Amino acid sequence: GAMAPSYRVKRMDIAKNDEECVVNAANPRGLPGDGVCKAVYKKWPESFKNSATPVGTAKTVMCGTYPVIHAVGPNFSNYTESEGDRELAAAYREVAKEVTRLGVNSVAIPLLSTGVYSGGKDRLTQSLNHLFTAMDSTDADVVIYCRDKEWEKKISEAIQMRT
Ligand SMILES: [Cl-]
Ligand SMILES: [Cl-]
Ligand SMILES: [Cl-]
Structure with a gap:
């Protein structure tokens, strides 16, 4: 684990991360998709062999020795708010189990269900709080990746508030 496990946020493409593994914001069918998923497909295409997995689960596939954790958030256009x-x-929670199993000291993660699966709603706080609930008990350094300048500031504020 990291000596003093931390959270950080960076506003850039997760395909250029400086962490020991990456979490893909995957679709259930293991297709190239859009947004984060398409950037991940271009950088680590080998990790899409048998990466299909149900909504609410995570499945790791190696690209060489680099782990790609395919995490399938729900598409809020199809699900009710409650489900x-x-x-x-x-x-x-499945991402936290995979990061622990892999023994990595750091992980690059996007905010699941905040892009085309958001159902047209702002889900920064919802998604980030579920990220914290799962990852707080892990000892890996977590680096959250985003693309919007206002989201970077809000994620950074939420991280600093708890320290
Ligand atoms: Cl970039
Ligand atoms: Cl999304
Ligand atoms: Cl963003």
Whole structure:
């Protein structure tokens, strides 16, 4: 584990991360997709062999020796708010189990269900709080990746508030 486990946020493409493994914001069918998923497919295409997994789960596939944890958040256009909330929390709990199993000291993670699976709603606080609930008990350094300047500031404020 990291000597003093931390959370950090960076506003850049997760495909350029400086961590020991990456979490993909995957679709259930293991398709190239859009947004984070498409960037992950371009950088680590080998990790999409048998990466299909149900909503609310995570499945890791190696690209060489680099782990890609495919985490499937719910698409809020299809799920009710109640059921989608439960599946989003579940996907993050599965990411925490995979990060622990892998023994990594750091992990790059996006905010699940905040892009095209958001159902047109701002889910920064919802998704980030489920990320914290799952990852707080792990000892890996977590680096959250985002692309919006206002989201970077809000994620950074939420991290600093708890220290
Ligand atoms: Cl970039
Ligand atoms: Cl998304
Ligand atoms: Cl963003």
